[PDB]
Structures are given as C-alpha cells and as structure tokens.
Ligand binder design. Structure first.
Ligand code: CA
Ligand code: CA
Ligand code: CA
Length: 195
C-alpha cells in the first residue's frame, strides 16, 4: 500500500523536532514471529532528502553478533526511480543502522545516509536522512520499505518487523516495496520574513 509523506526539513540529532509532531506514525504490523518488540516510524521529505524517524520498543538491546542484520537495527529500502524491478537496479537503496548508530549499506552509496540514534527507557530512536539524487516534487512516487531486526540476549536475530513485505525478500526484490507519495510542498514559498 501507500504512505503520503509531507514536506519538511528536520534536524538530525536523535531528538523529536516540533515539526515531526505534525505528521502521523506508521505502524509496521508484519511480524516474522511473536515478540514484545514493536516499532513506529514517520517520514518527511524536502528538496534534497528523505527523512525517517523510527522508535523501537525493545527491552533487550543486543549488537554482539558480527552479522549486521543479527543486531537490533532498523533497515530502510528505497526504489528512487520507482522502477519496481524484481532485482536491484543502480538507483535502489538498502541501508541499516543499529541502536548504537552503526550504519551498513547492502545497496547504494553509504555517503547518502546520515543518522543519529538515542537510547530510550525500553528502546531506542533512529533519525535518518537519505540524500535523493532525483529532484523530488509534489506527486513523486518512490518504492519504500521499513524493517526492524530484533535480536535477543543470545546475540542473534529472533524476529523481524516489516511495513510492507511479508515474504522476507525486500533485500533481493524492489517490487516487494510499498509506495510513498510526496506531497505538501508550497509552489510559491517566498515573500519576506515578517517579524
Ligand atoms: Ca531531530
Ligand atoms: Ca529503482
Ligand atoms: Ca532486542
């Protein structure tokens, strides 16, 4: 399905900007297995970037496994041109960041990915910026997926949460991503600053 993303420019610092309170939480509900871990995320776009704010409720954080997706982490997938190919093209992105703000890329230039995290009582927050190469405008559609990897005190992933893909294959197949459609940018956006 489809998330409508409002226009806005947050500060990347792990703190919830006032402007994030004006957009709605998306609740990923595709669980690989039962778990008390849950998550939500918000999206925002500006002329240069897509923005993700994720919060994860997770009472045990573990990142001892050397395999990235076997640590408590969130992953962001983007099909920027909206090709919806069945395998990864040159414009497809798959990024990951753990609760300690350690980032990995499975696809795309990691120089585009800028993140901060914050430890919360019972969980963590990720605030992420992905620099866009195509100029977005109102009505732009991109493919998007969001995933949480939940690891336990055995230092292994025991569960996944997904927004859109229930098949375990977003890492391989962009056509499984959902859609985001960008709206809300003013056309004028001018006039003087009135004090
Ligand atoms: Ca912020
Ligand atoms: Ca693509
Ligand atoms: Ca965990």
């Amino acid at each position: 399905k489809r998330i409508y993303v409002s226009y806005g420019s947050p500060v990347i610092d792990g703190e919830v900007d006032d402007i994030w309170n004006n957009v709605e939480w998306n609740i990923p509900r595709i669980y690989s297995a039962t778990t008390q871990t849950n998550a939500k995320f918000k999206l925002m776009w500006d002329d240069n970037a897509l923005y993700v704010l994720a919060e994860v409720y997770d009472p045990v954080l573990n990142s001892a496994n050397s395999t990235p997706y076997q640590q408590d982490s969130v992953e962001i997938f983007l099909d920027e041109n909206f090709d919806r190919a069945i395998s990864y093209q040159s414009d497809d992105l798959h990024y990951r960041v753990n609760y300690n703000n350690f980032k990995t890329t499975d696809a795309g230039d990691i120089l585009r990915f800028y993140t901060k995290t914050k430890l919360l009582p019972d969980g963590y927050r990720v605030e992420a910026r992905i620099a866009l190469s195509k100029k977005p405008i109102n009505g732009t559609i991109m493919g998007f997926e969001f995933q949480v990897n939940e690891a336990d005190s055995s230092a292994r992933r025991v569960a996944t949460i997904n927004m859109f893909d229930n098949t375990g294959n977003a890492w391989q197949n962009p056509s499984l991503f959902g859609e985001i459609k960008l709206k809300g940018r003013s056309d004028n956006a001018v006039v003087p600053i009135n004090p």
